[PDB]
Amino acid sequence: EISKGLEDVNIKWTRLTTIDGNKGILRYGGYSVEDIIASGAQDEEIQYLFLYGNLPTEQELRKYKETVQKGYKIPDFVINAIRQLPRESDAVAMQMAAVAAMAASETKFKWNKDTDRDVAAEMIGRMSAITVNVYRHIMNMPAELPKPSDSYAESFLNAAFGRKATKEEIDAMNTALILYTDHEVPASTTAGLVAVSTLSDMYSGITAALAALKGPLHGGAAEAAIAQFDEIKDPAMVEKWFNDNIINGKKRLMGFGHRVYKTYDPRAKIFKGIAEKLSSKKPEVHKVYEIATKLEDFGIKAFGSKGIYPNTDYFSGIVYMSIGFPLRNNIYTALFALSRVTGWQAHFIEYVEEQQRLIRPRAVYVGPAERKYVPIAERKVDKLAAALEHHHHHH
Amino acid sequence: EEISKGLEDVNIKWTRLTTIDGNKGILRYGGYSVEDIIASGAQDEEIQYLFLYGNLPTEQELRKYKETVQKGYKIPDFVINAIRQLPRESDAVAMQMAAVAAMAASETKFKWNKDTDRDVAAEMIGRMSAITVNVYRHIMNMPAELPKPSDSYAESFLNAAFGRKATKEEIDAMNTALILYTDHEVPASTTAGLVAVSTLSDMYSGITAALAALKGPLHGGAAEAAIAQFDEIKDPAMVEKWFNDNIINGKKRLMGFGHRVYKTYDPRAKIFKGIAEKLSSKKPEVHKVYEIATKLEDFGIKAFGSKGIYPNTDYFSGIVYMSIGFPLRNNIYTALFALSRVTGWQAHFIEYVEEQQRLIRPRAVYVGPAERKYVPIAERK
């Protein structure tokens, strides 16, 4: 029997994350994300939580931040690994090309309990520097690096855009990084787990994670929802669009439904609120929000009874857009990777350090039976010669 | 709650491509034994075609196929530079990964389509040659260069890599090597790539992820490990002693022996040994390694043969590569593996996405902390 999609197959144990799909609770190391955000946590604290297993003291957090900020400095050839690419490239593909360059140069990486967390921490800073430069390259802006500031989110926004971000923007970006840190074991995490299962380096693990994330069944989810709202164009048209395209089944309602949440995504609940506030000050963005909420009611009424509700990516694009990030080049998917790099590395360490096993699944053979090899010369037989071979005079 | 450790007993897909008889020691591609394939003198292109199309090509089909592959000999300057801007101490397979990653990014119009997947794969097999040529050249501080069209892919590869006309013996050996490593089971490289294309990510990303896995020492580096082992023995008269001091006492594993499937001589090793003997005999330092290798081989077989532990493909492969002219450094042999295996990878990705597409998304068992209230940082310790 084939375990299609490895669905319901346990690839590892984890301490990091758990989801209650029926109550809609997402917990990091035991802490609910709703509680984390309501308490005003820094994303750095949640990074620390993932890498160390507990929330940091003030001093620990102070030290952790220093280590992360070392990653703000990346070599020029890593930057050039981005900028030498056609500007049309997917943003996540750009991230992949840079980390692959980085994976190649990191010849002194070793899996080691003494250094794994520092390596990962600095890499989270490098991921900010990379993402900043992916964005600038896509926008035909000069290269630049993140610099230390009061928050990791602020350092990222300010360098990405080359301006001082508002407190509200910084806060929204801080929440986004926290909300996308980890979630079960999707295809990106899984691909990375497979790579490090060979004891390949952390960077290659991330590289493989990005390769899976590039696909439209994993990446592009936040962009798809926006494209859907833009397709509707006007709020008065929502029901007509909803009828012509969703109810009769011509296309899927983007940003609805989930493999685990049979209720409202806790991440979506949080993003919706932020989306309302931030978009309210940008007339063009607020319109997208109004289209989104109007569509939301039609979706819940139609699909709510079948456990199909808004997921995290229904409103996340609107939040990113309010902050200042455009739809093009799947930039939102790159923002997802900036966040998810913490979960990825945390899972890789957990795997390699405490439950290491070479990953090597099977395939069921359903091909041709054994047959003798026929040299190319005798493969296309001359019809006339063949027919004449065992022929005799017959008239 | 049971963990499928290493996914070892999990069927991740079906395949029509490859099968192994571990008791007889037979490897079959689309029903054809590699022994029979090599004895009959097939070009690797015929085997690339067998993997991508499901049958051996006619003369006409092969001719069209070669043309598409040769288009892959021209790759953009930024793919080449994705290699050459890297430190030369970089791992060869890592250089390959960075190159394919840049390519994946530039290929913005790739779409999975039953009508075009194979032409894409064919040209990519040619690009993979172009990439490996330049990975080798960069490691050796040689100028960049591209393969040129000829009747043999193996020859186009060798002539571009070394910048000289390879002998027939060298071409044949490389052609055989490409065939022998085309596909085998579903290792971490095939698997990682399968997980990536299961999101419908592009073929190039799929290759990129496969390379990510292959870079690890539990997957890559096997040919190199065996060579390092013959070199620590240094002399052939020193073999018995080295074998007692390092193997009998369990201090290190006998490299290039044993296999998860073959409980008999690896059919790839049998073919490789013959080539290694012939090709190395003409190069004194390499011949020295072959002589160590065969002498060690006898000890291994008398000691471990009864438990079904015999020489595998990586026992002699390094000697073949060295005789052709490729050095031990930077895991170049693993890059040469990737060069061959790129056919099997793409063939598996196509088989999966076209005919058995399913998003790969396994589970993790939670064994972490129970629920706890968030504590603001002011009140910690």
Numbering used by the authors:
A (entry chain A): 5 to 399
B (entry chain B): 4 to 384
Task: Show sentences the authors wrote.
Citrate synthase (CS) plays a central metabolic role in aerobes and many other organisms. The CS reaction comprises two half-reactions: a Claisen aldol condensation of acetyl-CoA (AcCoA) and oxaloacetate (OAA) that forms citryl-CoA (CitCoA), and CitCoA hydrolysis. Protein conformational changes that ‘close’ the active site play an important role in the assembly of a catalytically competent condensation active site. CS from the thermoacidophile Thermoplasma acidophilum (TpCS) possesses an endogenous Trp fluorophore that can be used to monitor the condensation reaction.
The 2.2 Å resolution crystal structure of TpCS fused to a C-terminal hexahistidine tag (TpCSH6) reported here is an ‘open’ structure that, when compared with several liganded TpCS structures, helps to define a complete path for active-site closure. Positive difference electron density was observed early in refinement at two locations: a helix near the CD dimer interface and the nearby subunit D active site. A second sharp turn near residue His222D directs the tag sequence into the active site of subunit D, ending with a bidentate salt bridge formed between the C-terminal carboxylate of the tag residue His399A and the Arg271D guanidinium. The C-terminal residue His399 makes a side-chain contact with His222, a residue that provides a hydrogen bond (involving Nδ1) that polarizes the AcCoA enolate, and the terminal carboxylate contacts both His262 and Arg271, which bind carbonyl and α-carboxylate O atoms in OAA. His397 N∊2 forms a hydrogen bond to one carboxylate O atom in the critical active-site base Asp317, which is not directly contacted by either substrate. Two well ordered bicarbonate ligands were included in the final model. The striking finding that all four subunits adopt open conformations suggests that the TpCS dimer cannot close just one active site.
